[PDB]
Ligand binder design. Structure first.
Ligand SMILES: NC[C@@H](O)c1ccc(F)cc1
Length: 330
């Protein structure tokens, strides 16, 4: 089997992407944030505290003939950005782009933190990291990808995120028309439960490539590119007027600037992020100070190849017995 679904930016800055997902019988379609940095499939629901729902589409398990309470199971998750959610668990039929999994754990939110409530466009998350990170207790549950894997033509999914435009998540096949040149594959460590890999270096604009190992994660659920302070300082030093602002919480730059590109290495291959991809617009409405899309990972403990980086590539998440990651230009 295979699946193919379009993923769409939630706003004009590409802050996140949503992908329609069919849950239950008859189908209830919710727009979920596919997150290769976490491993829980959770949704706003009929059980979510009413004051914490503001415009989201909810899953109502009582209206699904295939929903079954997973007795005694609870979940609770805290994300890198400080947001969180928790609740109980059903199993139900879940389909993405024509690919169907029966008996998928669907984690029903009883509580969500303010940032979720405040984002009416995201109805929940669909985790695509390794199932070892799944938070369901007392019986840990598998991701949609893990459940689907044995049925897929090939044990892979791909992320093709657009810049200010829709893109695609494919399951079970590699669309050879969706990228240019060849795909370069690189080793993954699953020890922390992430799609963790090591970039071979970077360049700023038309500058020379610096060969240096940068260990990080491929995370579709993180907006920005978070790299070591040395790398980030080298990037922003090429932008007149750019500075790190403790009050804003990172590097800002004059909105009048033209940003240089940023290149990262994948083995001997190179992925170029155009400068425009690094512009996240005014820090507040009407400001001439703009927020940068490359930020320091120093306070995080891990480097993060988030959407800013991933959207510049066609990315293969290879879930073979020994997982790997592939990157191509597009
Ligand atoms: N995208 C999941 C989010 O919780 C996350 C953020 C940062 C990180 F290093 C790992 C995961």
């Amino acid at each position: 089997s295979t699946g193919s679904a379009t993923t769409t930016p939630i706003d004009s800055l590409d802050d996140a992407y949503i992908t329609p997902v069919q849950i239950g019988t008859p189908a209830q379609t919710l727009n979920l944030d596919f997150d290769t940095g976490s491993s829980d499939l959770w949704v706003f629901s009929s059980e979510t505290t009413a004051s914490e729902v503001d415009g989201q589409t909810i899953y109502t398990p009582s209206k699904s003939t295939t929903a079954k309470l997973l007795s005694g199971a609870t979940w609770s998750i805290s994300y890198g950005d400080g947001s969180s959610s928790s609740g109980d668990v059903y199993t139900d039929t879940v389909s993405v782009g024509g690919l169907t999994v029966t008996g998928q754990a669907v984690e029903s939110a009883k509580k969500v933190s303010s940032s979720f409530t405040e984002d009416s466009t995201i109805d929940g998350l669909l985790g695509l990291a390794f199932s070892t990170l799944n938070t369901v207790s007392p019986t840990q549950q598998k991701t949609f990808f893990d459940n689907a894997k044995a049925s897929l033509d090939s044990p892979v999914f791909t992320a093709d995120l657009g810049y200010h435009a829709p893109g695609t998540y494919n399951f079970g096949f590699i669309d050879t028309t969706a990228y240019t040149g060849s795909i370069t594959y690189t080793a993954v460590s699953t020890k922390q439960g992430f799609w963790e890999w090591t970039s071979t270096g970077y360049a700023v604009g038309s500058g020379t490539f610096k060969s240096t190992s940068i260990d990080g994660i491929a995370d579709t659920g993180t907006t920005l590119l978070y790299l070591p302070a040395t790398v980030v300082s080298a990037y922003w030093a090429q932008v007149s007027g750019a500075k790190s602002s403790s009050s804003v919480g990172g590097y800002v730059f004059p909105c009048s600037a033209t940003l240089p590109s940023f290149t990262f290495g994948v083995g001997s291959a190179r992925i170029v992020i155009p400068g425009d991809y690094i512009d996240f617009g005014p820090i507040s409405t009407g400001s001439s100070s703009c927020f940068g899309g490359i930020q320091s990972s120093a306070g995080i403990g891990i480097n993060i190849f988030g959407d800013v980086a991933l959207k510049a590539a066609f990315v293969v998440f290879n879930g073979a017995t020994t997982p790997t990651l592939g990157f191509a230009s597009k």
